[PDB]
């Protein structure tokens, strides 16, 4: 180690468990409320409606999500699997 000559290290105030808890809480907030929990009280919204709201901010409409929701969901799940597999391979 490197602590034998007076060069002691300081443990962080927040351990990795608390960082994991914070990230999980933020993830639950953004999948259950969208952005209202980050700008006030936490509301509730279905995820397809949040996806439609996010679609309506980039110049596209909301019916093109409700008409190919299965395609969009399969694409997102494939993307999540692909990024996990790519991360597994620094």
């Amino acid at each position: 180690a490197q602590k034998f000559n007076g060069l002691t290290v300081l443990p962080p105030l927040l351990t990795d468990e608390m960082i994991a808890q914070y990230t999980s809480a933020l993830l639950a907030g953004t999948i259950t409320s969208g952005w209202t929990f980050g700008a006030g009280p936490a509301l509730q919204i279905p995820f397809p409606m949040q996806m439609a709201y996010r679609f309506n901010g980039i110049g596209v409409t909301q019916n093109v999500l409700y008409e190919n929701q299965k395609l969009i969901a399969n694409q997102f799940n494939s993307a999540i699997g692909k990024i996990q597999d790519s991360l597994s391979s620094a």
Partner: protein, 152 residues
Amino acid sequence: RLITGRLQSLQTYVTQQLIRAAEIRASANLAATKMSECVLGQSKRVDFCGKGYHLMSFPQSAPHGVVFLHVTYVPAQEKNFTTAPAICHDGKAHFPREGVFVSNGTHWFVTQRNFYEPQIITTDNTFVSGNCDVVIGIVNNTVYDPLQPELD
């Protein structure tokens, strides 16, 4: 040795002052950007000009610094509502143009998303796109068609 030690102390002080000046430059650039966006207009960056939806900011003079009195928009009272993404009328699918479909117990209304104000579902607040089968969570109702009565 006095000159060498004094030079070492002066160099250490100069490096500390330079690091402090770099930090001050970063803070001043952040303050200038905040004054350009949140004060000199309305910034769409969420959680940048304070917690909540930013409306405006009031800058005030401070000794060797600046403060910002941001005006935010945070909701207080919320309710519970059963919602649907689309509505079926006559083999057609109606979607809200600028709102959301909500029902209290037996009637369905269209309201704006960030504030509650129920309105009657007509053909002027909904748009027709497709048929009934494609949408998963579709709900039966009638659209008013405000023109029919008028044309009589």
